[PDB]
Amino acid sequence: MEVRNMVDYELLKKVVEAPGVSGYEFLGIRDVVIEEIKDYVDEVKVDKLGNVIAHKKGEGPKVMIAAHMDQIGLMVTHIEKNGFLRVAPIGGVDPKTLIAQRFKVWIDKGKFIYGVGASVPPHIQKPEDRKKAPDWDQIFIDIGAESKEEAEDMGVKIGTVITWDGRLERLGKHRFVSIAFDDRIAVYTILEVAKQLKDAKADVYFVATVQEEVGLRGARTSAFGIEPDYGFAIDVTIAADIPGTPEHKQVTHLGKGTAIKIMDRSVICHPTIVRWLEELAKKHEIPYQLEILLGGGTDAGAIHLTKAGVPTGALSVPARYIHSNTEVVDERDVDATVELMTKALENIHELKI
Amino acid sequence: MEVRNMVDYELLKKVVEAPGVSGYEFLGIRDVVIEEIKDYVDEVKVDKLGNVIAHKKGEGPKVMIAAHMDQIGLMVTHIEKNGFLRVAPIGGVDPKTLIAQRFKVWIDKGKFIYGVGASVPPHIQKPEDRKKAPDWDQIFIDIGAESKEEAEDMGVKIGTVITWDGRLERLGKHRFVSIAFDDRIAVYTILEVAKQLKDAKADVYFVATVQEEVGLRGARTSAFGIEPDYGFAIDVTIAADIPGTPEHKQVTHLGKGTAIKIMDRSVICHPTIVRWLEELAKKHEIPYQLEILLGGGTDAGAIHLTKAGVPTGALSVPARYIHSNTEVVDERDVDATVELMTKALENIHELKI
Amino acid sequence: MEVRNMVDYELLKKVVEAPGVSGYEFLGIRDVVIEEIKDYVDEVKVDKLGNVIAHKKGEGPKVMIAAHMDQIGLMVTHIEKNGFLRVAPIGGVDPKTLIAQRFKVWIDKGKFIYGVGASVPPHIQKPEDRKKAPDWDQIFIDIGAESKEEAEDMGVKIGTVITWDGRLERLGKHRFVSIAFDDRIAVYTILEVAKQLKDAKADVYFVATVQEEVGLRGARTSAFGIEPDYGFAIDVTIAADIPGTPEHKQVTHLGKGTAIKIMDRSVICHPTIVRWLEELAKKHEIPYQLEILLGGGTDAGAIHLTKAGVPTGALSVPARYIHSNTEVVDERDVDATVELMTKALENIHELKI
Ligand SMILES: [Zn+2]
Ligand SMILES: [Zn+2]
Ligand SMILES: [Zn+2]
Ligand SMILES: [Zn+2]
Ligand SMILES: [Zn+2]
Ligand SMILES: [Zn+2]
């Protein structure tokens, strides 16, 4: 569990279990996040996009910290005549992982039924048989209903209703958390920062955006008013020590320290900030890694689209996986990000250049 | 839950949760099965192959009922230098389903750690990328260990250690059980029969074989002494109402009644028995379906390999799925099999021809 | 030569040179094996299948040790009009290795002529040219005859007549034997065990089966009466330290210690026995390796098909190769198997569970 106690098992659990997709019946997560942040922040407001803005009052430059909380999911597009639930693809999800088992379909907030639809109708052809990759039709999920009417009675209606579902378990008693890696974590890092934030050298606005994995632009909207005068965002992706993988990708992750995003698809970290963070980490002896991604966009990049033209830095939590099959995290990694980020906040007054 | 109460939720749960692979640390299931059967049978003995033989004393022909309890699993073949656990294929498992999440690796009886290894190293090629089907190398499972030494310390040793793992949930509040379909169910049907068996017109030997999904022959060995003078075995497979599927396969399953195996890969049900069971079902108004399989072998077929040359009939529980992604069952189906089988037992004296 | 003297050079030579295929003109090997075993066993009998049963009299459980001695070969199917000898495929032989040179065609016991037929008629096509893999027609062997009549005069008649042929040489003066790996070796291990067997805690029946590489079932027949009450069989296969080979296969063999078969295609070693042997090896400080195979069947598995339902363990001699091109063995490996097996025999009384 809390091997280092750096990450509370309870906080990680509450956030990871909460449904993803704010504003959606999965919105329970939105309420949860604000439930705890309000205790350590002067106030929290809900934006039009459902974005949550936490306001830390202090003197200094406005630093915006943005964490994404869109997670991933699947949307039912219609009900088959056989009472089977169909699904529509979402982005940030790989069809190859489609679904293997246990899917949570939310009929309503607090009302969900287990559904499975890991298998898609077999293709015809001995070679196509080899093709185990499902077609764009994706896969279908069965609510167990026998008729479309029954499915409707179940309360299944068009609109994203299904979430990946999973369980938080500890892998490697020495360290490592399961589905804690995406979804929540960065949000967890933001919560921890607020908790340990005492002397505010600079006031920090915490913004949790939605639709970050898809429609990241919406996240930018919250960033628009809060992100002015600097901002940081935390998303994570990793090529990590996998067999058959070249060293060039292994360097992407090592399961140690933390990762500072040198550049991403949408944000080329302002060199001073990237370089500066590196300096800061060494001074405090905080472990860090330099990670560059060839693809993927972060909310930080979205912040870069603000008309303010504010530079953005990014922090990364190494030990990335994809949500569909895994989401292993490094306990140290979550801690490393929080520690580095917290110190950086005070330093930001000088750090702002 | 017990919508019809035909299948107790508790009994189904205990059997499905028990690990699969008797004699193996998964052997906990073996003990469980005998734990309950001993109360309703005069005695239970453990064979050399770990097969369990329940002896119902009565007067009449010896009828052997055989249920398989091998389930499916994966075996670690070695420990990678990176501390990753590797796996070796088992039979009755489809690589395409490989593993999506949460895998249970048993270090010892009662000691297991969660492991994940749903993803296999990406292939090189834009088209091979489409190929989402993993190679024979199969997939690898990470125990979260960082070093082979650590993995060994974890207690991971060569030998099948991993089980699919899953959770028993109710799908369709109207009916349907998740991972209850394979593994346990038929065994459950056998237990229920014993429980409701009161007046024994004929003595019935209940044999639970192991290595049925693989090395079905071993199951035959138990059948060798017990199966003499008739025997029945229950395994299940279904082509069931799936979209894009031709009607010719839909007829295989309908999620109603039960299924009598007309013929399988290894057993051509003795026509009299198949026909006879049909007659019996109609007389008692028990729903039934005639199912023929083009492939797959049942333990009943294995019984057919006895030197006695005893004919074997087979009962099937419709609503088949594969263990890797699903295992939906029909509550009615479990009930239908039990009801039909129980009545058949007494009728067997006349029925034996 | 006898670097450790663990394996006599003379015994290895006599067995490896003897022709393979008992009952066949290659049957000379059958006589040889019984020639030496009779001196250390109370008696030897020839079964109907040509199987040889050695009877070690002692008190205790009956332990059956089975070694295969079918080797591999090729059968002439007809005589071409050009006087060329044709061949039919055998199983356990890879066409790709077909034949490179020097083939021994037995016209009669003690009468053989050298024949070559490493090349098969070239295919037509610049790309098919690349295909160096011969077709199912396999390859043809020339007895040097110019006419079918001459070939017949030579005494070439339909029926497997040809053996791979080879020479026993020492590779690596430090250790390693050539064509000693398959064919003979396990048989050699059985002979050595009998020789060093003095105090018989348990009586051991030694059975040498035939048609093990093909028609392994026949081997089971001898096992049927002798294998009752436990049995062990030794066959070998290796993925061994080959370049371009992944570590996951390298672990299969290391050219050190011996290999205990955890599971094979047909036998899932009884866990207690596998585990037990491991315990025994450590106690006596005998080197061992755990090897699992994804394919291949061993005679031990065949023993598992006995109606007795007797559990079987298996010992493996690492450093496997295929008979067609190589058959390198580790001298230590042959010794390790013998040492471990001999101690196990006495322990078997307690070991039997
Ligand atoms: Zn994501
Ligand atoms: Zn993310
Ligand atoms: Zn199965
Ligand atoms: Zn089954
Ligand atoms: Zn061979
Ligand atoms: Zn062999």
Q: What's the rounded Cα separation, in Å, for the pair A253 and A233?
A: 19
B24 vs C contacts (CB less than 8 Å): 271
Reading across the β-sheet that carries B52-55, which strands appear in turn?
A: B43-46, B52-55, B204-209, B63-68, B231-234, B312-316, B259-263, B289-292
CA gyration radius, chain C: 21
B182 known ligand binder: yes
Cβ contacts of residue A115 below 8 Å, gap of 6+? A85, A103, A104, A105, A141, A142, A143, A144, A162, B171
**Cβ atoms A297, A219 nearer than 8 A:** no
Instruction: Give the chain B residue whose CA is nearest to the CA of A322.
Output: B119
CATH code 3.40.630.10 region(s) in chain C: 6-71+166-351
What is the set of active-site residues of A?
A: 212
Nearest to A50 by CA among A74, A72, A25, A77: A25
β-bridge mates for residue B45, sequence order: B53
Task: Please indicate if any CB of chain A lies within 8 Å of the CB of B171.
Answer: yes
Q: What's the rounded Cα separation, in Å, for the pair B172 and B167?
A: 15
Q: Which H or E run includes A273?
A: helix A271-283
- For C159, other C-beta atoms within 10 Å of its C-beta total 12
Q: What's the rounded Cα separation, in Å, for the pair B44 and B34?
A: 7
The burial of C346, by beta-carbon neighbours within 10 Å (0-12 exposed, 13-18 middle, 19 or more buried), is given as middle
- Which DSSP state fits C320? -
- Which DSSP state fits C27? G
Cβ contacts of residue B210 below 8 Å, gap of 6+? B21, B22, B23, B30, B49, B50, B51, B68, B69, B70, B218, B219
β-bridge mates for residue B262, sequence order: none
Query: What single-letter amino acid sits at A228?
Result: P
Give C129→chain B minimum CA distance, Å: 27
Please state the separation of Cα B159 from the chain's center in Å: 21
Q: What's the rounded Cα separation, in Å, for the pair B235 and B187?
A: 9
Give B81→chain A minimum CA distance, Å: 10
Q: What's the rounded Cα separation, in Å, for the pair B223 and B228?
A: 7
Q: Which residues surround ligand 4, an ion (CB under 5 A)?
A: B 182, 235
Cβ contacts of residue B145 below 8 Å, gap of 6+? A172, A174, B79, B83, B84, B85, B151, B153, B154, B156
- Give the SS3 label for residue C260: strand
Check CB contact under 8 Å for B49 and C251: no
DSSP line for A26-58? GGHHHHHHHHHHHHHSSEEEE-TTS-EEEE---
Dihedral in degrees, nearest 10, Cα atoms A321, A323, A326, A331? 60
Task: Please indicate if any CB of chain C lies within 8 Å of the CB of B160.
Answer: yes
The third-level CATH classification (topology) of the domain covering C72-165 is Elongation Factor Tu (Ef-tu); domain 3 (2.40.30)
Check CB contact under 8 Å for B48 and C304: no
Q: Which of C212, C327, C331, C339 is catalytic?
A: C212
Give C353→chain B minimum CA distance, Å: 10
CA gyration radius, chain A: 21
Check CB contact under 8 Å for B114 and A171: yes
| C212 assigned to active site | yes
A325 vs B contacts (CB less than 8 Å): 99-101, 116, 118-119
A245 vs B contacts (CB less than 8 Å): 121
Q: What's the rounded Cα separation, in Å, for the pair C117 and C123?
A: 16
- Give the SS3 label for residue B23: coil
Task: Please indicate if any CB of chain B lies within 8 Å of the CB of C246.
Answer: yes
DSSP line for A203-252? -EEEEEESS-SS-HHHHHHHHHHHSSS-EEEE-----BS-TT--HHHHTT
Q: Which long-range contacts (CB under 8 A, 24 or more apart) does C7-12 make?
A: C7/C177, C7/C188, C7/C192, C7/C331, C7/C334, C7/C335, C11/C36, C11/C188, C11/C191, C11/C192, C12/C168, C12/C177, C12/C180, C12/C184, C12/C185, C12/C188
Check CB contact under 8 Å for B118 and A326: yes
What is the set of active-site residues of B?
A: 212
Nearest to C335 by CA among C123, C218, C192, C230: C192
A173 vs B contacts (CB less than 8 Å): 113, 154
- Smallest Cβ distance to A172: which of B102, B144, B179? B144
Query: What single-letter amino acid sits at A167?
Result: R
**Cβ atoms B332, B4 nearer than 8 A:** yes
- Which DSSP state fits A10? H
The third-level CATH classification (topology) of the domain covering B6-71+166-351 is Aminopeptidase (3.40.630)
Which of B173-202 are b and which e, b meaning 16 or more Cβ less than 10 Å from the residue's Cβ? eebbbbbbbbbbbbbbbbbbbbbebeeebb
Query: What single-letter amino acid sits at A1?
Result: M
Token digits for B343? 């009545």
Cβ contacts of residue B17 below 8 Å, gap of 6+? B168
DSSP line for A68-104? E----EEEE--B-TTSPBP-B--TT--TTT---S-EE
Q: Which residues surround ligand 3, an ion (CB under 5 A)?
A: B 92, 182, 213
E runs forming strands in A255-343: 259-263, 289-292, 312-316
- Which DSSP state fits C225? H
Nearest to B311 by CA among B232, B224, B207: B232
Check CB contact under 8 Å for C262 and B47: no
Nearest to A140 by CA among B45, C249, B294, B244: B244
Instruction: Give the chain B residue whose CA is nearest to the CA of A172.
Output: B144
> How far, CA to CA in Å, does A230 sit from each of A203, A245, A263, A289, B177?
11, 37, 17, 22, 53
C-alpha angle with apex A252: A246 to A257, nearest 5 degrees?
135
- Which DSSP state fits B141? B
- For A223, other C-beta atoms within 10 Å of its C-beta total 31
Task: Tell me the binding residues of A for Zn(2+).
Answer: 68, 182, 213, 235, 323
Q: What's the rounded Cα separation, in Å, for the pair B119 and A29?
A: 28
Token digits for A108? 């309503």
Task: Please indicate if any CB of chain A lies within 8 Å of the CB of B21.
Answer: no
**Cβ atoms C318, C289 nearer than 8 A:** yes
Q: What's the rounded Cα separation, in Å, for the pair B300 and B313?
A: 7
Residues in chain C, overall count: 353
B159 vs C contacts (CB less than 8 Å): 262-263, 271, 274, 290, 292
A148 vs B contacts (CB less than 8 Å): none
Q: Could you give the maximum distance between any two Cα atoms of chain A, in Å? A: 68
Resolution in A: 4.1
Dihedral in degrees, nearest 10, Cα atoms A329, A331, A336, A337? 40
Check CB contact under 8 Å for A243 and B80: yes
CA of B93 to the centre of ligand 3 (A): 8
The burial of C234, by beta-carbon neighbours within 10 Å (0-12 exposed, 13-18 middle, 19 or more buried), is given as buried
- Smallest Cβ distance to A325: which of B101, B175, B178? B101
Token digits for B80? 């990678």
The burial of B29, by beta-carbon neighbours within 10 Å (0-12 exposed, 13-18 middle, 19 or more buried), is given as buried
Q: What's the rounded Cα separation, in Å, for the pair C80 and C69?
A: 31
Give B285→chain A minimum CA distance, Å: 23
Reading across the β-sheet that carries B73-76, which strands appear in turn?
A: B73-76, B159-163, B103-108, B111-115
Residue appearing with tokens 């809900």: A46
Instruction: Give the chain C residue whose CA is nearest to the CA of B90.
Output: C294
Q: What's the rounded Cα separation, in Å, for the pair C231 and C304?
A: 9
Cβ contacts of residue C31 below 8 Å, gap of 6+? none
Q: What's the rounded Cα separation, in Å, for the pair C107 and C115?
A: 11
